Amino acid sequence: SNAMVVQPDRIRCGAETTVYVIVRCKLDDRVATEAEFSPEDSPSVRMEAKVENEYTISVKAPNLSSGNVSLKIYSGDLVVCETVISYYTDMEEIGNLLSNAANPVEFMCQAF
Amino acid sequence: SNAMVVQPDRIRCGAETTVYVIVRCKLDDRVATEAEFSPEDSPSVRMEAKVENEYTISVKAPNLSSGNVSLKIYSGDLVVCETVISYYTDMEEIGNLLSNAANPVEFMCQAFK
């Protein structure tokens, strides 16, 4: 799409995180740039976004609950990025890290 | 410096990860760009680095051991970025996340619920 990368696409709940969106089309530095975070079962949230450069937008992600959140970025009534970013809690990530670090396929003495 | 942001600056050991560097000065598109990862007790690893745009470089980070790694970005004999990135393991991050809880009763209630 037009959004090359949304770094990071995963956000930890409660942690102040800055999301960076690199764009392929040079952004118009004359229009207004804002972001919209839409959770699953919650009203949308309108965050002001900073234009770091002709291809880079930054936004301080809001403290939302766990689950998936849709991220839109309007560069002046024009959607320059439409993607989904996921929120997660500390316990969720600890459980995923244990499920990853406790895998007998990671041992594999011969791996065959 | 010339590196506005280097994201991510932390890399999980097993997970293949792409690092993005935003530069303050225009990049020459027609010049070969590479990266140099210097670990603490290991020889440096050189990687092909893609110039994504006039201000953005991307590089696939190599699978290194945990600790701090120095990242140098060369735009053809020209150092455009010099920063440090940290490698971490699964258990290290588990400990870091546990260190963020309020009190042990919280973690116990969340574990036994």
Numbering used by the authors:
A (entry chain B): 1 to 112
B (entry chain A): 1 to 113
Original paper wording:
BCAP couples TLR signaling to phosphoinositide metabolism and inhibits MyD88-directed signal transduction. BCAP is recruited to the TLR signalosome forming multitypic interactions with the MAL and MyD88 signaling adaptors. Using a combination of biophysical and structural techniques, we show that dimerization of BCAP TIR by the DBB domain drives negative regulation of TLR signaling.
Subsequently, the shorter TIG2α construct was crystallized, and the structure was solved at 3.1 Å using data from a native crystal and phases from a selenomethionine derivative. The DBB TIG fold exhibits structural similarity to TIG domains from several TFs despite low sequence similarity. It shares an identical domain topology with the NFAT, NF-κB, CAMTA, and Ebf1 TIG domains, with root-mean-square deviation (RMSD) values as low as 1.6 Å (21–24). The conformation of these TF dimers shares a high level of similarity to one of the crystal contacts in the TIG2α structure with RMSD values as low as 2.3 Å. The TIG2α dimer also shares the helical features of the Ebf1 structure.
